[PDB]
Amino acid sequence: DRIHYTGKELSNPTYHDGQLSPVVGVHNIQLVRANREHPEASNGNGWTYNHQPMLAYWNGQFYYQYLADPSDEHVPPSQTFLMTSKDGYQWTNPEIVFPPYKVPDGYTKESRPGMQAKDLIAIMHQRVGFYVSKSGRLITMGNYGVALDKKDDPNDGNGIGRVVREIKKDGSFGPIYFIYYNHGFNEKNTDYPYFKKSKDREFVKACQEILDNPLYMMQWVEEADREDPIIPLKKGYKAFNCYTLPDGRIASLWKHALTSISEDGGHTWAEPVLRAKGFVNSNAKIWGQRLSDGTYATVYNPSEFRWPLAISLSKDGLEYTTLNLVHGEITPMRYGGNYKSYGPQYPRGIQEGNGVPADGDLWVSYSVNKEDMWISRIPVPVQINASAHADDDFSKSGSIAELTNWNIYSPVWAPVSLEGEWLKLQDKDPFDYAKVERKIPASKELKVSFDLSAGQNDKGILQIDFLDENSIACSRLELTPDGIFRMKGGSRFANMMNYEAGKTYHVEAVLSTADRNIQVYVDGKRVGLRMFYAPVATIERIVFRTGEMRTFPTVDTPADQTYDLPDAGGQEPLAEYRIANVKTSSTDKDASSAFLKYADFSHYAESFNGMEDENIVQAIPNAKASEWMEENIPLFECPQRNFEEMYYYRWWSLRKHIKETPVGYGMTEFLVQRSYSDKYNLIACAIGHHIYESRWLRDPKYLDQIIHTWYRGNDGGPMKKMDKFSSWNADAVLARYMVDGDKDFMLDMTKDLETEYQRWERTNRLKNGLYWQGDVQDGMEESISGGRNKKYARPTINSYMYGNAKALSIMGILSGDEGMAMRYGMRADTLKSLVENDLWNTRHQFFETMRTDSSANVREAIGYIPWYFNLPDTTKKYEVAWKEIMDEKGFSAPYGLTTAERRHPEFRTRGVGKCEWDGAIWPFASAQTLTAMANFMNNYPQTVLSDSVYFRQMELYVESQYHRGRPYIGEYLDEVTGYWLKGDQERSRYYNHSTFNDLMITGLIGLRPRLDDTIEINPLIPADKWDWFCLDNVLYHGHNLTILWDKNGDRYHCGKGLRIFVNGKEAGHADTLTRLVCENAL
């Protein structure tokens, strides 16, 4: 429909930069610095009105056209220059491309009776300067109008006409011809031939493409004859540009952000034309385009004044959501003159079809004060914030072109180069300074370090500011021209020390928002402590600048400037400064989180403590929980409310069970005092679940102690009641190692785990080799297949021990104990056969309990436990068992997965509300089933279950964890009604007898933990389920992982698609959601 702005962010015109934080890596590069007094090729021979640039990319080179008069706008002479560059930093000297044209003596106007032209030079004015033809030829174009005095209009449509000439591959120009004649002008009374007279047949064809193209005719409306038939839309809307939307339609922008649409390539435009709603724009033009990443961007002055120069982003070319800085400086205007006004202005980029710069970034040409010519480069995909602190070695970079993390303001006479290891700042400019900004993650506690060297101590200045997102400097450090390194405390400064030329100084600055101070160390010695002169919430930028900041101009300055400044062409004596090894760090508790911040999710914990009473308090009370969470949890977000809420609830629930005991932390299952628990109310049944979920906690002291408390909490040794429940806890300890990477912790647990395995082996094998367990001792009393006081061979314990044997064998390889590897290796092989041969029911095609005489002939949730440890072959015969996930006669029920198949006669026939396992949904089981389903779908060639099927069950598991409208994780629930079956009894509250966040992280987000240094993800969120999602602040293998998906690129602004970040640096990428693997990035 129409271009519009919906962002809340505004630009404040009492500041030069608007209090807009810039986007990352924007380089401001001055191309032309006016100097009347010392005219030269490189400044267009001392002309001081230089304005209205145009840009194109052709044969790997930038082409930059600007126009100039000697001093005053619409005061002759007047010409148009051309400039080139391979990289966009180092430019060739301005070359006169359209020279001054003679107005015929005796020219007149209706609006100027009695006046008539004598020896009068034409004024030039184009809204459009370039065209790449279909045959790859580059045509540049200009217009000549007439001004009989300074108050006259040469874009009145009584002009002379429009000229063109070819720019050739070799640099040289072709001849100059007219392409359009204003009324009363023709071949007979003009100084260049008509374009058609050229004998270059293809040059004519190229010129003719411009006339035939209606999108170019839209840009001639201002200068051309009024009502000329070749102008598609005849109303005089100003400085047209346009771009192609994703659907093929063309959107347009003119001055004051007027905007339309065209569904026929530019012949017609949707009435009524109106301002883009929510945009802030005036005279100084707006520029929009598509970018290499397929998104869009607008560049404009968001102000009735012509400052700052800003960028707003859009994913669809219509709805613009952001507003940040491109150019916030304002060189003061050296040379006065007619209609010149302060600030960066007339932004204009590359039309569609006229070039793609090889680096894929956004380059935009603009003037400053109608005086100096500039270009800015903005890295695409455009990034707002720094995903990673500084650790910059400049010797790795050949030229500033490669410093995509630094923002650079670089005037001609205050340039920014590299000198190997050093980022260098030169300043011989009285009216300007060199400035570099380094944007970093917004931080409350901040350390910043770098080496600093001056080339002098008797001249110039350097200011070091520490800014927030609204450009508030919280303190400043200064190298003074009277030889001192000092800090700003308030109005008063503090002299920290003297300084010397040519000497490296290691500067470290330690800033704290909370404490509201800065400490400055130089060579390990503290040399200054002051308070902030201005308070901030966070610091996001360090700025190095070769000058004091400039107060002029302001919103109250008069727009017209009659004066030149004193010594306008002169120079300061050269000052140099150098910096190297810029490091930053933060002690903030979520500093490891690359994109998400805990403050945006702190509300979840707040809601949970407010929503209901705190019945039982153990080590971490509710009042400290929000805080514990910040320190310990990976952050997650997605567009779906329930999944997100559950993510934060299951950590907030889990933490209640961290319990203080004399021998260390332990992890409870019931909060209430159970009659049969061991010491400290501990229960062994779900230790597997506890470890699998708690391994993602970042502070290891909790899980370290919880484990040690089981195996060593009872006079040095194991707790007694590990004899009471079957265990997969050796697999679970090796599951922990796969997430934290800590060999030592694990290898230390090996004997304790061998003791355990061997105990179960002595006590609980039948004579054929299979393990037996009574259904009670699996934690599954009154199960259908069963066995209260029975020694049936249940696929639970048999699979748990397969897992344990497999685990201990691996611990053997890593121990260096090749005997233990083998011994437990064969224990693994053996149990794998006994399950595959003796427990596969061949009628049912399903793993099932074997009673003393034959199979129990009932499919239960336990029949999916062999895949919890990847027990089965990849053969197709087993795939069929997973069909029962999607069958309402099997396990598919309204609120998730049943514990037994629903088709069975005996399903849920042993009463209710006393913990029965003959059908009802048990989170314990559901989590075993989903972990196994995850393993199936990840590690097996497999056609039975889609992404959608996995997601469905996790979604149902989310929906099931509510009670009275609030989140709730109870013991067990009704498969049809969703009723938690102990009701409002206290004992079921916050029950810790399952996983959820392991499932979120390992199945859904699909971070697959491994023994080695490959990172493997494989989300089971289906294509198009969610426009974005992100798992951040994960402590995998002593490195900080972020995993994110951004369909349109507009959620995180770091690219489209799926991405892995290790410590905030990208490690891999994928256009869709599939398996994405990053080798050796740890």
Ligand SMILES: OC[C@@H]1O[C@@H](O)[C@H](O)[C@H]1O
């Ligand atoms: O069915 C739940 C039982 O009670 C819990 O204490 C144990 O985990 C399990 O044996």
Ligand SMILES: [Ca+2]
């Ligand atoms: Ca200066």
Ligand code: NA
């Ligand atoms: Na701001």
